[PDB]
């Protein structure tokens, strides 16, 4: 049994490692195949325990990762891609 205080602290609004889809983050890379197809990014997650509040980012930053791109029939190679992170989150009214 996980204690009430521990479960409460673990689920309250904060930046948690979330697996984001690259193509959702770059919807114009229609013709590319990526490996991996999703990346591990810090994003807001958790609850505010209030229906009128929402967990939102108050501090953001970018992270650079080596992603393989493959354009069928044309080329294949790894290289650097930049992604948005959330350094700080806050329960704000909806």
């Amino acid at each position: 049994v996980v204690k009430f205080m521990d479960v409460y602290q673990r689920s309250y609004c904060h930046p948690i490692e979330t697996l984001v889809d690259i193509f959702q983050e770059y919807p114009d890379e229609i013709e590319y195949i990526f490996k991996p197809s999703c990346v591990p990014l810090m994003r807001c997650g958790g609850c505010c325990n209030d229906e009128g509040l929402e967990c939102v980012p108050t501090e953001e930053s970018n992270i650079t990762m080596q992603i393989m791109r493959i354009k069928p029939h044309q080329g294949q190679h790894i290289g650097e891609m930049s992604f948005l992170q959330h350094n700080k989150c806050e329960c704000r009214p909806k």
Partner: antibody
Amino acid sequence: EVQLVESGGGLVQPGGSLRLSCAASGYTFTNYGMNWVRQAPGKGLEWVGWINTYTGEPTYAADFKRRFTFSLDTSKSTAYLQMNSLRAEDTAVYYCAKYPHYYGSSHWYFDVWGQGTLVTVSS
Amino acid sequence: DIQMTQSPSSLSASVGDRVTITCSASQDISNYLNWYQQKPGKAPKVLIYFTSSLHSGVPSRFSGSGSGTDFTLTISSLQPEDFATYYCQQYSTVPWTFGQGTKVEIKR
């Protein structure tokens, strides 16, 4: 140091076969595509095709689809070019070149090349 | 198959001179063009990619311009070590294709 070394060149009779090899080193072979380019004596450059070192999938310039075959042995970080039914016009220095590491966007230029091996088709 | 036509086929120029090489594509290839330098007995070496981006380790006297069907390579001040044959390559549609080359000789 990133380097590509080729071998397998030499004399081959008309109608014959030969297999060239390109041994990569100094980087992860499976992270960049591999191209094959040729240059007849005293002449220009001609792209033969390329192979995806992660999936094994090859793409040939039309004129080469019929007699050439690209393959790879990742356990040896080597790419191969098998040529069949050779004619005198096939005589040339054959090169292998890897695709580059990108930044932001993709551009298909060849960045590290092998030294090239001369293949001479003669009886 | 896009066809690339380089001009001139060969030129001779003195050290310190500005040299410009031309390239014309048979159809619009946008800015998908690279330039290579090949010396005697060696493999080609990339100088510029994506019309005008200088590859790392290449001297600033080398520059590229253009778009569509017309491109240009420029050596602002020719040096003796610049003797070579220069080639253009398009990466707009497969198969990739090169120009026939321009042989640059140094006049002394």
